[PDB]
């Protein structure tokens, strides 16, 4: 079973995550979101809402024997938490024009000492997601590695949404290797083209889950491994208060 | 009082790489403060050190090799040529970075991540063979060169560094034609002992393979590779 | 050296860790980012329309050799509207558009080299531009540079017999004489209202309407260039040079095809 | 570091002209200077104290 | 068994909106994630959240 | 000695640009600088000491 300097807890409001097999928290770019006000806004921000700075936990998908290498699932931020599952975060988010935040994630998946396989979990700024910024529905190897080009663009070399997955480890990441761990912990600071974001039309960060070494096991072993995640906005700062977005969807 | 000048023969030429600036046409323009920004790097060497995936079984590339329950001293699990041109490295950041320079020097790091079951056990012999006598054909010949024994246990990966052994201070990055029996030698992976397991466990495992630059690694003279199309 | 790559960070070594060796470091500065992009590369060939020197400007292209150019290393043009003002694209168009067609030479306009190798998400820099006429005989060229996001329809001729490019207080450059070297050079400042520019992709829309079309962030270029001149038959190459480049957040580069051949590559 | 420039001579154009001007914004804002120049219309006699006063209603 | 693995979500929901009907709603209140491993138990404390200083026993 | 150059003026391009850079390698190798710049991903919480600890197995 799981041990000692590998047993770890993280308290967020009224939220706390525990793992008995961690490998540490990878802090991307080596910095955390400071929670500082955007220098481009004259209005004072609403910040430090306790009800907002906690972990939102929901399920991603199911890992099976069938997934092939590099098939993935994307979770666009802040969008995934802008709805009902986003609690007061979502509610506040829908009434502000702009949000500036960092992310702290934990993705979870257990198997046994008789299972073999590994996931790659990474977080990437400006990763190409669905149009509508929603979590992918099923695993896909869609539009890797040359991007999506137009129908007719018969001879085009590639499109700007290219993604050479052979290099996905350039992104802040950690491996969820079944023989080693059960959880992966990442944290990223705020990065964007501007001092704060009009989140409505931009999913600036994407949490990506990909298979790199396919699931293997002998008969009688657990057969499908669920994948869940805990996401927490790190010191979000809101500005430009107005009426509700509404069609939140 | 007008000053006399002698016009050089090269009058009027344009040099794509001139170590100098041209005429500014829109001065005193302040920029938009970008001081909140993070994640900046300044030297490619700063990130060339991050391991990316080696492609196995080209052109049906997979990011791993497979260990079996049999140790044939005659059968390498992998054989990589030590050339920043190996089709093997073609998509690693190391190779993509390197293709914009003429020469390299220093250590190459091959990282192996065991992805099998916790219940499995096994030992690998990873060797680097300098050129001169051809590639080794059995673990017995590889074992005569630089090598390491990797034992499976609590710790998941193994970082093997191929030492820069060369007559010249630097080595050419890319190949003109293809490099024979040359290149700079080979990295071969062999099983020493077979993968062993208990009842109820798979009998083969995947080993993730990545490559990166060592702290030693250097690149010089920026150029452009031959243009290509990913498709 | 035994290690645990799952942490997302791996300790770096030299031959010194496992064997009896010595480090073999030697200094070099050609791998700094600024030095690497501080050299000129071409983005395409352009043309001037007949008698543009003395009339209203109008979008037009010679052989998919247009009239104006957006200052950006990314793709733009779209050979299907070679007669419309050019636009930034999210893909590169091959030379032909059907099987039997060819990828090179590309039809769109871009810094193919930058495209091929830009391992960063965002960047900031100043832009040095070089206009090179493909002729060693006299050549007259009028250029109008408009900062990003400003008026780009230099269509109304306000002065009788004066190019409409040549109007206002917007920067205009002109070289034309029997003793010139024909080429034009100048550097433009950084004018995007954005703090830093998306280098490859920008995962967001143009309006809050989410009239869904991701890819490019608005006003993320260095402006537009309009040309008028006297040799409507000579084409000229436009080159970009990134002055004091800064990049943030490493990311992957363009895919390179598996040699379904050897165990190494080459050139071309 | 620096780029590819290795001229001994001092740049003939000064920097504010040769380059863009990097500025930095502080989080908490900055106060405009008090005055943008010396152009101004002036309001005089705004108040009181002094006239043919206190014959004047309470 | 020592060979088993798993994670539980234990939540405390204050009154007012009824009992949660899915883990997704529970997760909106006070909760903890319990990971199985070397250590056998988990001690969850429900915080005293109340309008009055005391609560009736029965 | 020197070659065939006899200009009074200081070379307009600096040396590192006008000429190649003669370097010298020492027999016994040289240590890379410790760091190539300040870009880095960081691993935190790596170890221990401090939690809801020593209820935790021995």
From Swiss-Prot, chain B:
<protein>
    <recommendedName>
        <fullName>Capsid protein VP3</fullName>
    </recommendedName>
</protein>
<comment type="function">
    <text>Forms an icosahedral capsid of pseudo T=3 symmetry with capsid proteins VP2 and VP3. Together they form an icosahedral capsid composed of 60 copies of each VP1, VP2, and VP3, with a diameter of approximately 300 Angstroms. VP4 lies on the inner surface of the protein shell formed by VP1, VP2 and VP3. All the three latter proteins contain a beta-sheet structure called beta-barrel jelly roll. VP1 is situated at the 12 fivefold axes, whereas VP2 and VP3 are located at the quasi-sixfold axes.</text>
</comment>
<feature type="disulfide bond">
    <location>
        <begin position="86"/>
        <end position="88"/>
    </location>
</feature>
């Amino acid at each position: 079973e799981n041990l000692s300097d590998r047993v770890s807890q993280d308290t967020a409001g009224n939220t706390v995550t525990n793992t008995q097999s961690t490998v540490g928290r990878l802090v991307g770019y080596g910095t955390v979101h400071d929670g500082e006000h955007p220098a481009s806004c004259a209005d004072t921000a609403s910040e430090k809402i306790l009800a907002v700075e906690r972990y939102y936990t929901f399920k991603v998908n199911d890992w099976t024997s069938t997934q092939k290498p590099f098939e993935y699932i994307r979770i666009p931020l802040p969008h995934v938490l802008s709805g009902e599952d986003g609690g007061v975060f979502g509610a506040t988010l829908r009434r502000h024009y702009l949000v500036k935040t960092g992310w702290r994630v934990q993705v979870q998946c257990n198997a046994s000492q008789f299972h073999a396989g590994s996931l790659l979990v990474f977080m990437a700024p400006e990763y190409p997601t669905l149009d509508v910024f929603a979590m992918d529905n099923r695993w896909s190897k869609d539009n890797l590695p040359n991007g999506t080009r137009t129908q007719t663009n018969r001879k085009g070399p590639f499109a700007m949404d290219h993604q050479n997955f052979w290099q996905w480890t350039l992104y802040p990441h950690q491996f969820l290797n079944l023989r080693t761990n059960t959880t992966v912990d990442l944290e990223v600071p705020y990065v964007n083209i501007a001092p704060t974001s009009s989140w409505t039309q931009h999913a600036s960060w994407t949490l990506v889950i990909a298979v790199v070494a396919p699931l293997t096991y002998s008969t009688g072993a657990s057969t499908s491994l669920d994948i869940t995640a805990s996401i927490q906005p790190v010191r979000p700062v809101f500005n430009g208060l107005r009426h509700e977005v509404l069609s939140r969807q | 009082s007008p000053i006399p000048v002698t016009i050089r023969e090269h009058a009027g030429t344009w040099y794509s790489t001139l170590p100098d600036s041209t005429v500014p046409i829109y001065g005193k323009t302040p920029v938009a403060p970008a001081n909140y920004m993070v994640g900046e790097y300044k030297d490619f060497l700063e990130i060339a050190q991050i391991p990316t995936f080696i492609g196995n079984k080209v052109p049906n590339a997979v990011p791993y090799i497979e260990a079996s329950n049999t140790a044939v001293k005659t059968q390498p699990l992998a054989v990589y040529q030590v050339t920043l041109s190996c089709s093997c490295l073609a998509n690693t950041f190391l190779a993509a970075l390197s293709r914009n320079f003429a020469q390299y020097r220093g250590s190459l790091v091959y990282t192996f991540v065991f992805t099998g079951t916790a219940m499995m056990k096994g030992k690998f012999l990873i060797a680097y063979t300098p050129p001169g006598a051809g590639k080794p054909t059995s673990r017995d010949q590889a074992m005569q060169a630089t090598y390491a024994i990797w034992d499976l246990g609590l710790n998941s990966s193994y970082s093997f560094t191929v030492p820069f052994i060369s007559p010249t201070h630097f080595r050419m990055v890319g190949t003109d034609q293809a490099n024979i029996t040359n290149v700079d030698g080979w990295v071969t992976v062999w099983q020493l002992t077979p993968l062993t397991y208990p009842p109820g466990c798979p009998t083969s495992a995947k080993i993730l393979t990545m490559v990166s630059a060592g702290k030693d690694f250097s690149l010089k003279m920026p150029i452009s590779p031959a243009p290509w199309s990913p498709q | 050296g035994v290690e645990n790559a799952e942490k997302g960070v791996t300790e770096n070594t030299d031959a010194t860790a496992d064997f009896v060796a010595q480090p073999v470091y030697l200094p070099e500065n050609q791998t700094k980012v600024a030095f690497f992009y501080d050299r000129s590369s071409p983005i395409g060939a352009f043309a001037v329309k007949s008698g543009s020197l003395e009339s209203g400007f109008a979008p037009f292209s010679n052989k998919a050799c247009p009239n104006s150019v957006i200052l950006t290393p990314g793709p733009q043009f779209d050979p299907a509207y070679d007669q419309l003002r050019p636009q930034r694209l999210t893909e590169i168009w091959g030379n032909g558009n059907e099987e039997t067609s060819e990828v090179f030479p590309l039809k769109t306009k871009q810094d193919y080299s930058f495209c091929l190798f830009s391992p960063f998400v965002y960047y900031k820099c100043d832009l040095e531009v070089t206009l090179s006429p493909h002729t060693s005989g006299a050549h007259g060229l009028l250029v109008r540079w408009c900062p990003t996001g400003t008026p780009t329809k230099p269509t109304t001729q306000v002065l009788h017999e004066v190019s409409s490019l040549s109007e206002g207080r917007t920067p205009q450059v002109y070289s034309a004489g029997p003793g010139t070297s024909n080429q034009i050079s100048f550097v433009v400042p950084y004018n995007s209202p954005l703090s830093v520019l998306p280098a490859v992709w920008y995962n967001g829309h143009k309006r809050f309407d989410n009239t869904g079309d991701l890819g490019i962030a608005p006003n993320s270029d260095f402006g537009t260039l309009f040309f008028a001149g006297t040799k409507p038959d000579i084409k000229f190459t436009v080159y970009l040079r990134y002055k004091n480049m800064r990049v943030f957040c490493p990311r992957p580069t363009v895919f390179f095809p598996w040699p379904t051949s050897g165990d190494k590559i080459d050139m071309t | 570091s620096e780029g590819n420039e290795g001229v001994i001579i001092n740049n003939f154009y000064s920097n504010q002209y040769q380059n863009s001007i990097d500025l930095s914004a502080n989080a908490t804002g900055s106060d405009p200077p008090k005055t943008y120049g010396q152009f101004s219309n002036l309001l005089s006699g705004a108040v009181n104290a002094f006239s043919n006063m206190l014959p004047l209603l309470a």
